[PDB]
C-alpha cells in the first residue's frame, strides 16, 4: 500500500452527550467563578469571615437610586 495509496479520511467528532454536558458545565462554572473573583478583587468587598478576601470574596452591596429598574426589567429579550 505505501507505494501508491492515498486515503483522505476525516476526523472523528465527539458525540458523547455526557462529556459535552460536563465540558459546557465546567467551562461555565469556571468562567463565572473567574468573573466573580475578578470583580470582587477590583472593588469594594465584603466577607462572611473576619478578613477573608482570598477565599469567598463577596462583591459589596451597592444601593441603587432607582431599584425597580434593575430588579423588574428583563436583560435578555
Amino acid at each position: 500500500p505505501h507505494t501508491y495509496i492515498k486515503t483522505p479520511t476525516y476526523r472523528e467528532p465527539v458525540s458523547d452527550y455526557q462529556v459535552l454536558r460536563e465540558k459546557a458545565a465546567s467551562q461555565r462554572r469556571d468562567v463565572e467563578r473567574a468573573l466573580t473573583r475578578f470583580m470582587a478583587k477590583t472593588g469594594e468587598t465584603q466577607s462572611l469571615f473576619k478578613d477573608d478576601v482570598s477565599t469567598f470574596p463577596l462583591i459589596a452591596a451597592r444601593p441603587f437610586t432607582i431599584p425597580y429598574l434593575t430588579a423588574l426589567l428583563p436583560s435578555e429579550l
Binding site: 476526523r11 459535552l20 465540558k23 459546557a24
Partner: protein
C-alpha cells in the same frame, strides 16, 4: 465586523461602516545544545498530536508586520473579522 471582538480598537480608530543568511546556520542541530535537551534524571507529551494550523506552518505572519511607519500599505482600515471558529472542544 465593527461590533465584534476588537470593537474597542475599531471605536478608538473611529471607523463606522455597518554567511549569516546561509540556510545551514538555521539548522536546528546547529542552533541547539544537546546536553541541556536531555533531562538526565534531573528535577514533551507531543508526537501523536492531532493536527497543525496552516498559518503556523506556511502562513508568513511576519510578512504582514509593516517595518516602515513612512510607507505603510497596512494602515487605518476596518480589517473586519470573518468570525470562523474551529480548534476543538468549541461546541460546534
Amino acid at each position: 465586523w465593527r461590533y465584534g471582538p476588537a470593537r474597542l480598537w475599531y471605536d478608538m480608530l473611529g471607523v463606522p461602516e455597518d554567511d549569516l543568511l546561509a540556510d545551514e546556520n538555521f539548522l536546528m542541530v546547529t542552533q541547539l545544545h544537546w546536553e541541556d535537551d536531555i533531562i538526565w534524571d534531573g528535577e514533551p507529551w507531543y508526537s501523536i498530536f492531532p493536527i497543525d494550523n496552516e498559518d503556523l506552518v506556511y502562513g508568513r505572519w511576519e510578512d504582514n508586520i509593516i517595518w516602515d511607519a513612512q510607507a505603510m500599505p497596512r494602515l487605518l482600515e476596518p480589517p473586519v473579522l470573518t468570525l470562523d471558529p474551529n480548534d476543538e472542544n468549541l461546541i460546534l
